[PDB]
Amino acid sequence: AKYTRGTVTAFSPFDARADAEALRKAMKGMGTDEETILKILTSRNNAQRQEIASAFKTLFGRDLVDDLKSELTGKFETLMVSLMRPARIFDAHALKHAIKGAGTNEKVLTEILASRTPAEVQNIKQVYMQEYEANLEDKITGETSGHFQRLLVVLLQANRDPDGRVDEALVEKDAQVLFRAGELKWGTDEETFITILGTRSVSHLRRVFDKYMTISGFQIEETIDRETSGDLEKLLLAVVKCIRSVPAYFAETLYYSMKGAGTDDDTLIRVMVSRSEIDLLDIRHEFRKNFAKSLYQMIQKDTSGDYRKALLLLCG
Template sequence: MDPQKQQYYNKYPPAGGPPGQPGQPQPGYQRPPPGASYYSPTGSPAPGQPPYQQSPYSSYNVPQGPPQTSQHQYQPQQYPSGPPQTPGQYTLPQPYTPQQPQQGQYGQPPAPYTQWGPSSQQGPPPSAYSQVPTPYPPPPQQYGGPQVAPQWSQSQYPEPGYGYGVPPTPASPGYDLAQRAFVAPVDTSADVETLRKAMKGMGCDETVLIRVLTSSKYENPWTMAQLVGDYNKRFIRDLAKDIESETRGGVETALLALIRGPLEQDVRVLIKALDRAGTDEDALMDVLLCRSNADIRAISAEYRRLKGNDLLVDIKDDVDDTLFRLYSMVLSATRAEDAAPVINSDIDHKVTELQRATEGTIGANAVSVAQIFTNSNSAQLNAMSRTYERMYHRSLEEVIEKEFRGDMEDALLYMLENAIDRARFDAKRLERPLYKTPRKDRLLINRVVSLYWNRPRQDAAKSAYQIHSSARTSLRAAFRSVLSGDYEDLMVALIRERK
């Protein structure tokens, strides 16, 4: 028999024997309660019995000896449940409750996870935006030892507008395939027949092409893509090749830009701008500067698909080192999202850095200025412009014009003017190629078609054109006075004006 059981039977012998003998209870015997263990209920051995060894709580993995500490643990007075207990006084663990972090310097911490604990079957609360990593509190330590409270460092809460707590700016229409699921298909059967009839046989009825392709039915890039796809399937032909063979000049360039959609057109503009004959810096700025991070990523991926090369590699071969540094920052897609707030203390700090990098040094630090410009959204750049003039009594535009030359000056002014007044900026972008000698039709078409896919921005540009243009006339009147023929009709239709 087990020695411990023998000790129990010596103290509590079974009934049936003579007193004092096995089988009879001893004098003063009291029957133990049902389910009593072989050990003394008081935790100490019976008189005259050897002490027993308490078995470890294997299910809780209680360590023997004093609790271990490390440099990553809080001091005892910081434990949420009090100081650690001495050896031999471990109690059952309490449910783990994460501590709510204190408010950081740059914004609010995430909401406390009151429904998530080690005993809950519910997972961590989903993040509102999967692109933004959510710092979860560390898991509790093993039961029985001191638990480590969640440690929240300031680095886990980046500045608002630079990656945390700010919704990402959605991609522009036509730049994300997921948008297609939210666009209802349209009936294109009659229109594809009309397009084929207009280009079939001798000659081409360009008026019909303009009327169909600029119809309000195809104002969305995805309905335009459906029209092109349905035409190609219906006639086993390529609509782009048919237009190339049947049209000429500005009409051909504008119609091709229209049916390609905004994303493919941007990439085609980049490919043309970076050819070996010379770099078209205006086209390069139109496509890449002041764009959302989502659009930049889409353009880089589509360029790689169509051209087979990395966009940044091709840019490096065509521009100087300083401008390459600027475009490498742009293509890194680290611009503050449009919803990022304007923080006055941050604006003041950046304005000071801009002054040090321009007027405050001999020879402007172009890389520092480019980094501030490319990492800020339009609202933040506008705030910097106003703050710079308030602090140093001169406009930021004048400083850039004084400290920089050439393509770098043009790129910085492009971003700054777009941030200060985008409608006026767009109006000037339409006026310059229209009245330049010789007229730059391709640049004008690229800018008109890019505005066509963004109607609110186009309407604002048309209103600003009448106010800020040199002739103080409407954009429609400017096209009528400078352009002619089907090209004139197409450009007027692209700004949603009719005869």
């Protein structure tokens, strides 16, 4: 029932052709006017960016994204190109690159499958097939293994129980099962808790989590936590956090993408872009309350140049 707000809204008055002309002017000739590019791309929403891309190609017979890639470099390029990616294909594309090539980007698989709604997951699967002529499930199963793979496959079904009647007996039963699983460090008969966390309704699991706290004295996350956690544990954590609050999950994700030396820029960019028109405002709020600091301040200290300027404009 929760209603969320993003930080990027449709620009007005909108003129796709004028914006396309401005972007071309900013790139034509040696060098680049990065300032104009970031000001336009961060202030026009995703749908508007697609209209600008179409106008750009009609006026010049050039591809806006290809030109941005040739003109820009580093993190700034990645951010601008990610902003340009159609909202409808963003996740399919992210998942494709998370599984393509050597190794697997478990973080991306986990982040997306744990936080997307059933409707969003259904779109992802259809788009993946349409765009890449491949079955997403088969691709994921081929690049992942074990319990981690199975929980991902469960989430991929986008078939979690719908919110409905409260089942007190089941809440207690599930809480008892998870308590015992937690005491066993989530390494015994994993199938049982994968069914519970992957398929029970969001409303039911929130009740189960509260009961779990009463039984153990700890919140379920506290028993699954720790750096020395495996892929399954990280997915369990993401699922639990998203069941509670997707915005809080992303606030924490942003926090850890910047806490400590260096930056997980791929994650910072991915989250800022993907959530910009959904719940980034709520994310900002959760960030400030849960970390005693503003997202704006953390970004300002961790980034620089046009990349930073664009990120801050997105943050709003």
